[PDB]
């Protein structure tokens, strides 16, 4: 079973892989002695992946709140 932790870890890993792709594109077009850790990295793919998992994904489901048994199930 992929629980919630492993699923969120996989989505964050995909976002981080996209971020590494973007930054690897960035370093090859950037000069040394002018790169700041605040600058070269971009967190947009990470938050995009997290919001793509939490919204409109078949695992992240609308919680059924009929009664406590429905919630526990």
């Amino acid at each position: 079973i992929r629980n919630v932790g492993e699923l969120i870890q996989n989505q964050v890993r995909t976002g981080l892989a996209r971020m590494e792709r973007v930054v690897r594109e960035r370093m090859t077009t950037q000069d040394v002695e002018a790169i700041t850790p605040q600058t070269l990295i971009n967190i947009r793919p990470v938050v995009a992946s997290i919001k793509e998992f939490f919204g409109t994904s078949q695992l992240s489901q609308f919680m059924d709140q009929n009664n406590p048994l429905s919630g526990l199930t």
Partner: protein, 89 residues
């Protein structure tokens, strides 16, 4: 670079956006991203307007223009026959 970005401005979007509008809107997008990575929070449109020296209503107008349409044939969920296209009147 000039021809590639001109073709991207002219033909990529379904609704045509002129090249100067495209360069304005993606400059605003990149400086908004710079603001986000600088202060770690979503800025108010007034701050972005005053730091770019345009009116806030112009900023609202251009980020309303800078939108991508969603296709009519998006599936709704588990059901396959029910499409998004039959829901609109």
């Amino acid at each position: 670079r000039q021809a590639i970005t001109r073709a991207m401005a002219d033909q990529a979007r379904t609704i045509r956006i002129p090249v100067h509008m495209v360069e304005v809107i993606n400059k605003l997008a990149r400086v908004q991203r710079q603001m986000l990575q600088d202060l770690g929070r979503e800025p108010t449109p007034e701050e972005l307007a005053k730091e770019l020296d345009m009116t806030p209503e112009k900023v609202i107008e251009v980020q309303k223009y800078g939108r991508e349409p969603i296709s009519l044939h998006t599936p709704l969920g588990e059901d396959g026959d029910s499409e998004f296209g039959d829901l609109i009147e």
